[PDB]
Amino acid sequence: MYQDLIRSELTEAADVLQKFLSDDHNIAQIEAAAKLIADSFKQGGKVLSCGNGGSHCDAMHFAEELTGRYRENRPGYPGIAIDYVFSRYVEAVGAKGDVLFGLSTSGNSGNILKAIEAAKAKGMKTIALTGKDGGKMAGLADVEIRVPHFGYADRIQEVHIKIIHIIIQLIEKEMA
């Protein structure tokens, strides 16, 4: 049996989650990011979500949940998902007022870093969900939500999913 080892991963997730919600800053960043997408939507814009390998699944669902909750009477798609692979999609499909939503457990994903630069060069606000110390994109995005974890991606990927879920239902209230 591996009761203790298995529970330890679970208790670690608990510790990580605690450190995250106890800090008012993250709670505020969570609110800022949802306020951005709302405003963009209210001005017709859209959200482009990109996630670095194994994190792109989250980026991909977030876009789906947004399109399946706001397509109703509204042209286009509110949320679309996808080293220059992401930055080429920004230039290609992004417009002023749109938002970039990128996930990177470390703050060092090159394809997402460039994605952020392209958004800036397109009049697009940026939101980055990161881990550790925010890595190289720390401070680069308009709004950064950082998970206080310096170990493997798992605990971080897990908190990103909670953030995404919370952000989505705030947007609904934002839209009201």
Added chain:
Amino acid sequence: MYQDLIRSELTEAADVLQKFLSDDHNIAQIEAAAKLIADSFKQGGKVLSCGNGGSHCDAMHFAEELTGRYRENRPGYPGIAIDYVFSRYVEAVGAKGDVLFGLSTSGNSGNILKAIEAAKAKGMKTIALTGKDGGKMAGLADVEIRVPHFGYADRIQEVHIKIIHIIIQLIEKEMA
């Protein structure tokens, strides 16, 4: 305020997680799941995963997360992600000794229920990560991992992903 709402979702996830890890049965189920798959692996088997939105990504994470860690010197693919769509796939690519990994927050997803039936008919073991009361999936899977929470999907999906991460690491040890 509005942030107190953000914190209430987070602490709600804190509660659900705490409840989940406080039941030794849940922990034993996690071990029985990784054991099943590991055994399958040791006889040339593979895991077929599936879920419906939100759970589609989890099914996707698990499979690709499996291939990366057990592709070395193993023919084929250790893991593959997918009302009769899932069941038709099991019938076509599934084989005796294989494992069906299904996720359904409610436990009543018809396509996954079909998938389970085909799995049995194929001589395949089945694992199901559920929530709420276990739905119809309870008593059907060879191993059920139920998140102790009766409510929307968010809290459950959030624990399902935690389970997946843990299961992946447990396969390394459960078969090393």
